[PDB]
Amino acid sequence: AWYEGAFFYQIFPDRFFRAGPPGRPAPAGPFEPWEAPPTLRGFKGGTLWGVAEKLPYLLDLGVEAIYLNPVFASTANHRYHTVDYFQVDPILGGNEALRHLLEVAHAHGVRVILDGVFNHTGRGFFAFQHLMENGEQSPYRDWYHVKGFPLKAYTAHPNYEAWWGNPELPKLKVETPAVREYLLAVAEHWIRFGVDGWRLDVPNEIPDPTFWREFRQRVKGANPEAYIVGEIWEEADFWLQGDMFDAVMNYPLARAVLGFVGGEALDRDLAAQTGLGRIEPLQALAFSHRLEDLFGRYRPEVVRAQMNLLTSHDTPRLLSLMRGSVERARLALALLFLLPGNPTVYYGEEVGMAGGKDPENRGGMVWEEARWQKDLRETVKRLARLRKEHPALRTAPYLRIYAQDGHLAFARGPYLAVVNASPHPFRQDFPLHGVFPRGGRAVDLLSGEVCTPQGGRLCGPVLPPFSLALWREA
Numbered sequence: 001a002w003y004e005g006a007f008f009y010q011i012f013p014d015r016f017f018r019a020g021p022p023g024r025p026a027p028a029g030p031f032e033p034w035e036a037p038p039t040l041r042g043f044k045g046g047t048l049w050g051v052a053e054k055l056p057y058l059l060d061l062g063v064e065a066i067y068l069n070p071v072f073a074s075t076a077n078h079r080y081h082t083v084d085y086f087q088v089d090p091i092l093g094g095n096e097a098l099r100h101l102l103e104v105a106h107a108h109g110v111r112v113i114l115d116g117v118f119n120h121t122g123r124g125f126f127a128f129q130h131l132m133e134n135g136e137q138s139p140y141r142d143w144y145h146v147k148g149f150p151l152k153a154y155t156a157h158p159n160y161e162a163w164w165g166n167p168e169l170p171k172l173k174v175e176t177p178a179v180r181e182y183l184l185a186v187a188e189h190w191i192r193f194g195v196d197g198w199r200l201d202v203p204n205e206i207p208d209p210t211f212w213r214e215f216r217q218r219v220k221g222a223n224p225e226a227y228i229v230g231e232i233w234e235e236a237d238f239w240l241q242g243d244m245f246d247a248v249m250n251y252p253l254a255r256a257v258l259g260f261v262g263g264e265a266l267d268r269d270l271a272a273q274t275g276l277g278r279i280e281p282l283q284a285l286a287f288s289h290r291l292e293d294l295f296g297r298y299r300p301e302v303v304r305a306q307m308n309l310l311t312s313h314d315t316p317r318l319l320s321l322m323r324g325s326v327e328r329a330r331l332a333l334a335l336l337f338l339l340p341g342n343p344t345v346y347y348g349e350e351v352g353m354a355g356g357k358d359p360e361n362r363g364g365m366v367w368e369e370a371r372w373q374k375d376l377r378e379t380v381k382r383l384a385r386l387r388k389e390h391p392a393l394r395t396a397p398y399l400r401i402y403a404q405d406g407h408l409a410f411a412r413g414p415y416l417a418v419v420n421a422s423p424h425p426f427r428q429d430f431p432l433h434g435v436f437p438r439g440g441r442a443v444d445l446l447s448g449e450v451c452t453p454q455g456g457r458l459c460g461p462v463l464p465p466f467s468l469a470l471w472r473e474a
């Protein structure tokens, strides 16, 4: 429903905006200065109160949904090391902060989804601490995959199953009834609290197929409109048959757009340092083939709900991926709003923040307007409003019309999108292949340009370097 074409904005809680009172236990020490370089353990103190305060900023941009990284009590600044699934982290302001955020968000028609880390917990979680203090005598032993005792929890060789072998992330034993009951109650609780959906962290670490099916029924049961999206970096047919997730994070689409728009100017060395991998340059046709596969291998309702991002807290920032090329970053972001799926933007990309891989990509949000790349932001604001006023952009099919070099043209129902992802101008006179049957006056919704096709060929002026156009029969 609402999650099929919606503009999503991803926020890393500790780095958006610091405001309001903390929750209990309140921190008692200095916070890493806001404008200082992000570190592995540093906390800047952003809160959910602040996120609620910055809603007018998000509304201006056109945001329809907020995807938040983990917000429950954790000892990590990124919060993937959960300590208590039933309490919003004190530093973020506690449950009352999340409650207030949801009220303001919903009052203005904005949805909010949370990040669920259910494969593992931090070492600070109750059950794990219980294991550490009591060893074999602990009645919580079966919450984890204990190899032996002692646990050696602070060595590079933990005596228990852990995410990627990292001792900071003890792997949960989901088959244990007490565990599955806890996790399912968690998934349900927050949906009833007011949350609109869940973004599942590395769901593949929990291969048990019955868990996710139960998860879906419990969540959808508490709110049929809840959105469930999972983190899968490649093909995800298994998780999209309809009995598990509604969609996944479309990293494959991110690789395609980056390769096509990034061209040879893409910093493949930077991208190779993360899950993006070494992104291969792509020409028009090859790029279109990838879209055609991505847009057809899943049911249409799934394709329309796909979380279409370019970057995230797990990738280098866009501007750094384009070696400072503002025009390229602008085109890649722009193009997302012209494809089926949910265009998703990582906080700061709309104003041009730069950075390599984590923690460089998790800097404090810049609120000094005079410092924003206004061109990038206006494009996002412009195309988000375009998508909002032209619903066909989120519902229609994808049909390639022209492909050559870095020149692409595809149709979305009544619209013909023309992409010029190259340094040189592109005259829009290619054959329409039947796109505008009526064969009359047409207008580029983006520039206002107007013209009348003849001979089955488009009639617009040259498309400037790294520019976009969206025609519709006037």
Ligand SMILES: OC[C@H]1O[C@@H]2O[C@H]3[C@H](O)[C@@H](O)[C@@H](O[C@H]4[C@H](O)[C@@H](O)[C@@H](O[C@H]5[C@H](O)[C@@H](O)[C@@H](O[C@H]6[C@H](O)[C@@H](O)[C@@H](O[C@H]7[C@H](O)[C@@H](O)[C@@H](O[C@H]8[C@H](O)[C@@H](O)[C@@H](O[C@H]1[C@H](O)[C@H]2O)O[C@@H]8CO)O[C@@H]7CO)O[C@@H]6CO)O[C@@H]5CO)O[C@@H]4CO)O[C@@H]3CO
Binding pocket: 164, 165, 202, 204, 205, 231, 233, 234, 273, 274, 275, 276, 314, 315, 357, 358
């Ligand atoms: O010993 C661990 C590891 O240490 C080094 O790697 C570090 C790396 O240099 C840092 O950048 C960072 O990594 C971050 C990464 O860059 C981000 O992208 C993100 O990670 C995401 C993945 O990129 C993404 O693919 C997904 O992960 C899922 C996979 O898609 C899925 O296939 C599967 O993964 C399994 C592998 O297929 C399998 O080969 C095996 O992987 C092992 C490696 O082969 C082995 O070398 C080692 O990895 C080293 C690495 O070489 C060092 O350079 O251990 C691996 C684990 O055994 O097993 C995988 C597990 O199933 O499943 C995963 C889901 O878990 O999502 C992730 C998360 O979004 O975040 C990374 C962390 O910030 O840190 C690492 C570690 O310090």
